[PDB]
Amino acid sequence: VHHQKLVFFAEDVGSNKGAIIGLMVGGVVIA
Amino acid sequence: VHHQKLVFFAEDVGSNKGAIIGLMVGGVVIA
Amino acid sequence: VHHQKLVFFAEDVGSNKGAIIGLMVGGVVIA
Amino acid sequence: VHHQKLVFFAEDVGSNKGAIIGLMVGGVVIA
Amino acid sequence: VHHQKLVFFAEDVGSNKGAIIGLMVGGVVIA
Amino acid sequence: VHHQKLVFFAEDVGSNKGAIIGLMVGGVVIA
Incomplete structure (x- = not known):
């Protein structure tokens, strides 16, 4: 199973x- | 199974x- | 099982x- | 001239x- | 001229x- | 001219x- 670039900013x-x-x-996560 | 670029900002x-x-x-997530 | 570039900033x-x-x-994570 | 407690959280x-x-x-102010 | 406690958290x-x-x-102020 | 406690946390x-x-x-101020 493959996950890729899930988040991305160019x-x-x-x-x-x-x-x-x-x-x-x-x-x-208390961010 | 394939997930890609799920979020993206150019x-x-x-x-x-x-x-x-x-x-x-x-x-x-308390963001 | 494969995870890649999950987060990425160019x-x-x-x-x-x-x-x-x-x-x-x-x-x-209290960030 | 008198200004007092202008903002206040108890x-x-x-x-x-x-x-x-x-x-x-x-x-x-870009807050 | 008098300014006092202008902001206040108790x-x-x-x-x-x-x-x-x-x-x-x-x-x-870019806060 | 008098300024006092302008900001305050108790x-x-x-x-x-x-x-x-x-x-x-x-x-x-880039804070």
Whole structure:
């Protein structure tokens, strides 16, 4: 089974005060 | 089974105070 | 089973005051 | 001339991804 | 002329990814 | 002319990834 580029920016990301997750499965993220 | 580019920006992302998730399956995200 | 490039920026990331996670499975992240 | 407590929380503030301003007069705030 | 307590929290502030300003007058704040 | 306590927390500040300014007048703050 194949997962690829799940998240992708082709361009400048100014910031992130939160959570870029690529693939979550369990637990917690207080981003 | 194949998943690809699920999320994609071809352009500048100013910020994220929240959650860009690509593929969520379980748990919690207080973004 | 194959996972690849799950998160990806082709461009300058100004900052991160949060959490870029690539693949979460359990526990906690107070980002 | 007297200004007092202009903004006030008697209780826990979870977050602020924006701008709590107390007294704005000029310029710019991209919060 | 008298300004006092312009902003005030009587309680725990979890975070601030933005700008608590007390008194702005000019210029810029990219918070 | 008198300015006092312009910003004030009576309680634990978890973090600040931004800008607590007390009194801004000019220039720039990329917080």
